Amino acid sequence: AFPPGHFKEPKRLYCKNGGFFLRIHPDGRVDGVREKSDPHIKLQLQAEERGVVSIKGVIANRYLAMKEDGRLLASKIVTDECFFFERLESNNYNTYRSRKYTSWYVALKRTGQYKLGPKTGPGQKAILFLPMSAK
């Protein structure tokens, strides 16, 4: 389990699959960008209960949501589609698995676009994100 400090400051989430930071855009898009100075990659993780987080784009003021067809979008309201199991894997990257659609992961393709839920799964580079300082 992650300590209280994990939740005290914003983070960038760096994806192993292409080196994209996860971006939540004010325009509702969720995608990846390599540029570390992009304003929309500063994210706030919030614990909903032990091991479960919501992921909010600070500048966008929107929360990451995974829909029933597996799309990612950024939602103005917190709904049950906005909660993810946060787990540290053995390679020291984390995964974020939907608490609602429990086989599917937050993921980015090598193109930078999100990867649809039904195409995700354990062991893929697409699902691995490293939290780091947002400074």
Residue numbers in the entry: 20 to 154
Sentences from the paper on this structure:
Through these signaling pathways, FGF2 regulates diverse cellular responses and has beneficial effects on wound healing, wrinkle reduction, and protection against neomycin-induced hair cell loss. While the therapeutic potentials of FGF2 are widely recognized, a significant challenge hindering its broader application is inherent instability.
Based on the calculation by in silico predictions, two FGF2 mutants with four-point mutations (FGF2-M1 with D28E/C78L/C96I/S137P and FGF2-M2 with D28E/C78I/C96I/S137P) were finally designed. We successfully solved the high-resolution (1.40 Å and 1.48 Å, respectively) crystal structures of FGF2-M1 and the FGF2-M2/SOS complex. On the other hand, SOS was used as an additive reagent to promote the crystallization of FGF2-M2 because it binds to the heparin-binding site of FGF2. In the crystal structure of the FGF2-M2/SOS complex, negatively charged SOS was bound to the positively charged HSPG-binding site harboring K128, R129, K134, and K138 through extensive electrostatic interactions. The RMSD value between the structures of the FGF2 mutants was 0.144 Å for all Cα atoms, indicating that the introduction of mutations did not affect the overall structure of FGF2. Both of them adopted the canonical β-trefoil fold, in which two sets of three β-hairpins are arranged with a pseudo-three-fold symmetry. Thus, C78L and C78I seem to allow for better interactions with neighboring residues, which prefer a bit more hydrophobic and a bit larger amino acid; the hydropathy scales of leucine and isoleucine are 3.8 and 4.5, respectively, with their volumes of 166.7 Å3. The introduction of isoleucine at position 96 in the FGF2 mutants likely dictates the orientation of the T98 side-chain. It was also identified through the crystal structures of FGF2-M1 and FGF2-M2; the substituted proline residue at position 137 forms CH-π interactions with W123 to stabilize the β10–β11 hairpin, a portion of the heparin-binding site of FGF2.
